[PDB]
Amino acid sequence: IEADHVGFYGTTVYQSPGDIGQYTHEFDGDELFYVDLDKKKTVWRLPEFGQLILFEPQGGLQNIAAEKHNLGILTKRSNFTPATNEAPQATVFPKSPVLLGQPNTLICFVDNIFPPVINITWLRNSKSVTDGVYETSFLVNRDHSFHKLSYLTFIPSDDDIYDCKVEHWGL
Amino acid sequence: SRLGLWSRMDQLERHFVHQFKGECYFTNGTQRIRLVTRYIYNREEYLRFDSDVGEYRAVTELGRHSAEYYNKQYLERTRAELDTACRHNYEETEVPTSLRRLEQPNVAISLSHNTLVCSVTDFYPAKIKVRWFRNGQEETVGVSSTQLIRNGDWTFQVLVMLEMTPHQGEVYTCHVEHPSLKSPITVEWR
């Protein structure tokens, strides 16, 4: 569909087993926030985001409940047709051109995720790294698979080798 | 505040997924709004309300009875959402946030016949125009470009390359135009 702008206002995904939920908003293709279902808090993408204009998180909770309700009904109606695991792809890229001793961020773009359950780990020189990592929500695709980005903040040194490794049922 | 679109409740090694998608399509500000909700079982969209159609419809057999239910119960309040959610979010929430967000691009020429790389990074919104010039003249042959790369943190980056003849005393310039700038950025090289 064509348009100058696109809001995604109330994207909800629910999943069993494990009762796994996710409520997000999105504008022009970027995540505004998600609601944290344990803390019942709105969590914004950038710290500049929910200051002037807020979103009350309980509305997110309701959509989660309806979707848990809908899943059950629909699961049964399909005679229990289970989800087909997909094979996700990872692609790394820098946020700005890499220079030595220069503050940078590696960005892992992971696409064709389904179902939305996945591990995205960073490895520096084959050894796992967790210091400095941020990971987005499951972001929707038109074909109803998801994508997701991890960010590894880092100090560029020569001989430093980074890679983004993905664990999914579909591999 | 910001408002969400309602996921409407239906009637009564393995994994199962349900997905509700509520999509507001704005064209020319708020002059034309299109509201689309989608109910998806696993990867299958079975039920859809589309403001242009004006009511719920089953997309697949799986949503046959769901369409009629959602039309009896939810039809009127779903239509109204085009106004209380879509229009309300745009006009009262996006305008003073997203639609005002301006991030100026960082331009950096680098070298790698050879290849000049114009890195254009950390900008928003997406609209941008990057050109190479040699002697005030626009290069066309030997210009390669990446697709606009979305970073996921509300900036974009793009990379524009030029294969060139390194004659000493030739000056290549990367010219960049973007809504954030009151004047285009120009960055030169050898």
Curated annotation (Swiss-Prot), chain A:
The protein's UniProt keywords, in alphabetical order, are:
Adaptive immunity, Disulfide bond, Glycoprotein, Immunity, Membrane, MHC II, Signal, Transmembrane, Transmembrane helix
Alpha-1: annotated segments: 1-85
Glycosylation positions in this chain: 119
GO CC terms in record? external side of plasma membrane; lysosome; MHC class II protein complex; plasma membrane
Region (Alpha-2) spans which residues? Answer: 86-171
Q: Name one GO biological process term.
A: adaptive immune response
Name the membrane topology term: Single-pass type I membrane protein
Q: Which residues lie on this side of the membrane: Extracellular?
A: 1-171
Provide the GO MF annotations for this entry: peptide antigen binding
What is the annotated localization of this protein? Membrane
| Main location as per UniProt | membrane
Ubl conjugation recorded as keyword: no
Cysteines joined through disulfide linkages: 108-164
What region holds the Ig-like C1-type domain? 88-171
Give the UniProt family note. Belongs to the MHC class II family.
Please report the name of this protein according to its UniProt entry.
H-2 class II histocompatibility antigen, A-D alpha chain
Taxonomically, what lineage is the organism?
Answer: Eukaryota, Metazoa, Chordata, Craniata, Vertebrata
